[model samples]
Target: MDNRQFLSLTGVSKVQSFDPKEILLETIQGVLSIKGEKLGLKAGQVEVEGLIDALVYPLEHHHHHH
Candidate 1:
């Protein structure tokens, strides 16, 4: 939760599916679902140009919506 545009991750086995609007990552844990726009790319580990709107992993984050 440092940068708003770029996201880097770890423990990802591979991406289930890749797209500009949505991405599903396969990891030892499970799916790391991301929703964004103008998403740049992905590396073997995990690096993306993310305008990350919604992030869904094995659980939730501090952020809550109303």
Candidate 2:
């Protein structure tokens, strides 16, 4: 499925970060993977256990708590 669709299928939400280090912290989640692409949009991938891909990290190196 598409990124957004995959996210909703699971239970993950995108976290926005303005700092690179902050982004790293978010990706430390066991199921989360961060990828750098999409213009200045920082992106991360989240895979839910027994579910589906849940979320994208950021849209550059942004950070968010929840």
Candidate 3:
């Protein structure tokens, strides 16, 4: 798949369900299932990556808010 398709898949995964009753984490996990390990990468790596992403997002996107 191309970069655009990959990004769309990732975005769709992140917001899999807008409905309040839908399970979000499970949906994300399912998405990761399709994007399995590569070059030593693992599902846990995605978790850590997300944590790091949250930690740095504000700083990385600070220019827009300020």
Candidate 4:
């Protein structure tokens, strides 16, 4: 991945959510939360033209939200 403003990932199982400012993905390892602007995805690769602000890997849990 490029430090300027790019992200490339493999073993992407699913894409949970996405928008111009944020993207959430499910990989083989865990859940990936991307915070940025103007993010785009092509196949298993991701591209962000604005800025990659943060990358978070939260703990996986099986539960219900109410």
Candidate 5:
């Protein structure tokens, strides 16, 4: 989102899972899956030693029912 050095995300609701190589986050926008090396995390923030390899965002379409 910002730089290749690390990823700084906003509207993050929660962190689903995390490890040194991968991280899964739940955001207000959608679910963000990040893969890299030496990953770091906090509230709405992430850092990685190795450059980000892959990023996936699967958004959920909400339909309001009357």
Candidate 6:
């Protein structure tokens, strides 16, 4: 948790859910479970502030294969 502008997480114990019903997250002491919300993803960076719905967008990371 950074400033009120963005959110940064540095520990992913498990996210083995692909298209899973319940999203999983780890916070050490407290438990944060997103039930009906959308969110953005990044290589290691995450932005916060969702209008109403769980909206997620990105602007980083570079990967390619050929």
TM per candidate comes to 0.64, 0.19, 0.16, 0.61, 0.60, 0.30
lDDT of 1 by residue, 1-66 (tens): 555577777877766898888888787756778887877634446678857778777754456769
User: How close to the true structure is residue 28 of candidate 3, measured as C-alpha lDDT?
Assistant: 28
- Model 6 stretches with alpha carbons more than 4 Å out: 1-5, 16-23, 27-31, 35-38, 41-66
- For 6-60, candidate 2 gives per-residue lDDT tens digits of 2212333544442322222233333343333231212343322222222354344
Best by lDDT: 1
Candidate 5 or 4, higher lDDT: 4
Model 6 Cα lDDT, one tens digit per residue, 1-66: 432233345555554332323344643543345433333356764333322224233322465557
lDDT of 5 by residue, 1-66 (tens): 644484565666877997878888787766778886667645645544556877787654877567
lDDT (Cα, tens digit) per residue for candidate 3, span 1-66: 322221112223353322222213333224222222221133432221111111111133235553
Better of 1 and 6 by TM-score: 1
Collision count for each candidate, in order: 0, 11, 0, 0, 0, 1
lDDT of 5 at 6: 46
List the global CA lDDT of all models.
0.74, 0.32, 0.24, 0.72, 0.69, 0.40
Off by over 4 Å in 4: 1-4, 41-46, 59-66
TM-score ranking, best first:
1, 4, 5, 6, 2, 3
| Model 6, total clashes | 1
